[PDB]
């Protein structure tokens, strides 16, 4: 048992407060333990923010002056994180965790981007080779997901059927807008006889688009 799961809006505008909830199951948040809220910034630097002890008294990272506030709900078994007057620096993956000794339990982590940027859906572009690719032993297709925001775009091939030899590259920011790509490789005999589609989803903008890679030549 003992499970932690973070939740809350993943995009807050500057000058606002970001709130996260950590729902604990399989252990009373009053039985024992300190319930920490720990964040990881891009670059990977981790920062201990604070904790709400089982008894109810909180301890806060002094760096997080009068911006932090941690509270809980005994009945529902979950604690909260309220961080005020946020800035782009608070963009980070937030975790809630506990632990002592050899044992520790962390939540899956929740990404939170602080930005005044409007949520933009992606434009998915199928990437096929030039007219007359010779066709060696195998064919390498591609998929470019461009101009979206905030982060969290998911790309699978053929609804996940095509798993091996796929390469989803991390998103780069350029002009306050993300770009991402993914190549897949199958044997020359697979494509284009068997359909190869690109499955993209950007929950922030509620967009889900499939883009099959039609060949340019033959």
């Amino acid at each position: 048992d003992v499970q932690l799961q973070e939740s809350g809006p993943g995009l807050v505008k500057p000058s606002q407060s970001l709130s996260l909830t950590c729902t604990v199951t399989g252990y009373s948040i009053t039985s024992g333990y300190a319930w920490n809220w720990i964040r990881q910034f891009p670059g990977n630097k981790l920062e201990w923010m604070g904790y709400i002890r089982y008894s109810g008294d909180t301890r806060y990272n002094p760096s997080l002056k009068s911006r932090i506030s941690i509270t809980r709900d005994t009945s529902k078994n979950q604690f909260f994180l309220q961080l005020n007057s946020v800035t782009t620096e608070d963009t980070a993956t937030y975790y809630c965790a506990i632990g002592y000794g050899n044992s520790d339990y962390w939540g899956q982590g929740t990404l939170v981007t602080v930005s005044a940027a409007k949520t933009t859906p992606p434009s998915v572009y199928p990437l096929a080779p030039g007219c007359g690719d010779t066709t060696g032993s195998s064919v390498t297709l591609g998929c470019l997901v461009k101009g979206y925001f905030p982060e969290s775009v998911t790309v699978t091939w053929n609804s996940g059927s095509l798993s091996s030899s796929v390469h989803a590259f991390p998103a780069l920011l350029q002009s306050d807008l993300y770009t991402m790509s993914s190549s897949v490789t199958v044997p020359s005999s697979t494509w284009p006889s068997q359909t190869v589609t690109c499955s993209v989803a950007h929950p922030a903008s509620s967009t889900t688009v499939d883009k099959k890679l039609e060949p340019k030549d033959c």
């Binding site: 000794g101 050899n102 899956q108 434009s123 590259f169």
Partner: protein
Amino acid sequence: DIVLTQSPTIMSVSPGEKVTLTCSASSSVSSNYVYWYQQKPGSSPKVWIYSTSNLASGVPARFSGSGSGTSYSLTISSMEAEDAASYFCLQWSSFPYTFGGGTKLELKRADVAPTVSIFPPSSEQLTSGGASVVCFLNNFYPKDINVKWKIDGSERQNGVLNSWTDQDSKDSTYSMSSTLTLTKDEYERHNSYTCEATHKTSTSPIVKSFNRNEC
């Protein structure tokens, strides 16, 4: 509020090699409250060593910790591919509790040239007046590979957005991705588009180009 310093920050280790990570504190801290954390990409850190030298559950014997005062170190006797990850040392001796910068460990493997792919813009994009030319440099090692974009012999550096994946769990290789984005205009104004890859491998750069022949 002790500051913890980790070195090296990045390091490549050959399989079977003994590596020692270090964690220096700004002021003495009680060994008891010095934990180490391992973080594989995609997952949150997992306690690896607690109280300086005690191995957490599931942690293999090739690992061990040692320390007291200012210096604390994590040791791996025989590096394995699954040991490639980030190791963070934490301290909850003083308040507030602080972490180190981390130490990323890379696993060395037989060198390998990348399989390059170049893709012209899709009609969908041109219709929007944009023109991206994507080049995929897959399954290579080392990661320090240099990618130049040629256009009718000329070199174009502005408007290039690159991206690497982390080292692969299966083959320990890397994969890159260069996207040269242009307007439908300078695109429709040139012919050959070259993706020249300069890796530690081949003397002759790995070149893959196409011409906009309209098809």
